[PDB]
Design a protein around this nucleic acid. Sequence first.
RNA 1: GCUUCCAUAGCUCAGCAGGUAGAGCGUCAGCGGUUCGAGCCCGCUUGGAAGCU
RNA 2: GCUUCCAUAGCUCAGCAGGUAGAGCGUCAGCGGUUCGAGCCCGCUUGGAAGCU
Lengths: 307, 307
Amino acid sequence: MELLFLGTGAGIPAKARNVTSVALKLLEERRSVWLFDCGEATQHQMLHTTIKPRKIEKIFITHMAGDHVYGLPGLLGSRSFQGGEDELTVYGPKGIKAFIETSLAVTKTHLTYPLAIQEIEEGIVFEDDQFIVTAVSVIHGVEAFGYRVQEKDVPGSLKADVLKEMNIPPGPVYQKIKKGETVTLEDGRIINGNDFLEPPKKGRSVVFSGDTRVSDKLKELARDCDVMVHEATFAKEDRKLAYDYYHSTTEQAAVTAKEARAKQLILTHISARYQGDASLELQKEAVDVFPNSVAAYDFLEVNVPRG
Amino acid sequence: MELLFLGTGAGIPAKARNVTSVALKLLEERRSVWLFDCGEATQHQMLHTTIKPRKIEKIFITHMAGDHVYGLPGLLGSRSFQGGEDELTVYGPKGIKAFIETSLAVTKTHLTYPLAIQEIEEGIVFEDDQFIVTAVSVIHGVEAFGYRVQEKDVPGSLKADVLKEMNIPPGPVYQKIKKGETVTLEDGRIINGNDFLEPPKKGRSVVFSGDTRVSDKLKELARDCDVMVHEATFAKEDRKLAYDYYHSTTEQAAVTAKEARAKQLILTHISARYQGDASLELQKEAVDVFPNSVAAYDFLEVNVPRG
RNA sequence: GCUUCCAUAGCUCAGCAGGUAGAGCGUCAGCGGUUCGAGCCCGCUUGGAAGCU
RNA sequence: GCUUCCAUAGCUCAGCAGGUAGAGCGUCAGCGGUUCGAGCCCGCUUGGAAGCU
Ligand SMILES: [Zn+2]
Ligand SMILES: [Zn+2]
């Protein structure tokens, strides 16, 4: 599981930063990648990474904003252009269906795969046995969300060499044991899987605030979270500039992380008004509030380890 | 007047070539630039050129195809994002209005300028005193066009130093003369402007075939034209591969130019299946039919001089 | 970096319609182009002043 | 270059459901990871075979 930022920009593309799109790699977790927001030219950034279209299972959009979605049409099309048969679900706000649907239609684009578009709302927007992705409304205007990708706890490791020392040959009967199931051994022996198990490994969590003004909702969404990808469009001083555009300030994101007891904070969606010099300044403004902070940047990849 | 190719690709972006978009620079001609097709990330390519959004007066689309239009939303938006107040007219086929209109709407994008969208059809799609842009149907499916940008003849140079030798002080009365008008001089003198004029300078012409199969219509559209930007998706041999996808072959474009008596041919919309090595091979296949041919490539700029 | 707007005799402010350059007490920043003609229109290169959703 | 699919004892063809490796006359290409356990799942690096709207 790794975070690979494909565009850390804001408003419009700049040679320094492309418009927003953060990729959550879950290849060894579920064999795929999830994009969060897909600003224009996101597929283009990808051609510089090892992330491949067909490997994207689901795109989550934070709020309808060309710098967050003008990249869907061309991306999905490319996935179809290169084969891709798996299903892809786009999760977004009201408007996302129309946008995607119209774009393909006018372009007479027939997708060689199943496209599920879901216009979400607060609460669980996707869940299975491995992950639970809850969304929430953020301060940036009606139809704006912050997402939390929560990986559910994984089972404890199998005390395999106790099973062996008990003369229980390693084989299928093993995974049944790994599942807590009580089984009957070839020797009419009965053991309770649960007995030979290690305490469960807590699962990772990543949060994407999207575009928003300092919010208490968001604070709660990222509780104890592992990584909170937070947008910091402005420096500390421009507190007013942020409020009016419904954005946030480095120091603001940092307070948020600290208050949420998040483990790490990544500042993204930086405005071109700051330089490759200010970028470390922006970062410092945050580090003074929340030690473990990082100013995201195009192609920065941050692995998320099992704490 | 110069042709600056912003994407010479085909189907999908490649680090070598971005998807289609050719810019016709008319800065010293009418203070602006016209884009022909605006594939995704076209604005991005621009950030590497001196062409600026606000400087684009009108985008002409050849046929609805994501690799030709997924770039409008983000481009127009950016023009609005950076001020821009001049009017911008997008000329395209049926579908272009819906696409542009829906994209801005869902994104709640209010344009700080007037946007005129015109869903064209064969014939003159724009004309004034300087230019006449005629469009035509090409072989690539209903709603596919090839454009000819025809600059109208400019007036002959003023025989100024004959006017002087005739003791006619240079001043306003001059441009009236440059206009053929017969005027009355400060000394109740009467001269016929037309008399002191040089033969008119013939005006330049550029053609954009767009995506199409070898066509006789196209051949006629580019008659005597100066530059014919022609799509050559395939090499000579893949004649069948081209026919089926409604595309063209180097040799085909070259025949076309030769037959049209075009002055120069630029091969574009190259498929990634060819390399930076094949690209000169592709070009050679054409040069054997039409000497003056060039394989377009990202950021190639070709000025169009007054022959 | 991006976008836009400025560098007019000795100071301020024009020249907000290309016609040998002004109003109060001068190589119109530079090189080049368009043009009959450029401070005024288009490139390029220097120096400044805002804003960057 | 892109995408996908291959490199299984001596040849062909499996192993198209992770459980000390097969059917006709073997370091499952290599290094590393996940896992109790990997030819089989995920990276990386070598060599091939198509197609690239
Ligand atoms: Zn945004
Ligand atoms: Zn095309």
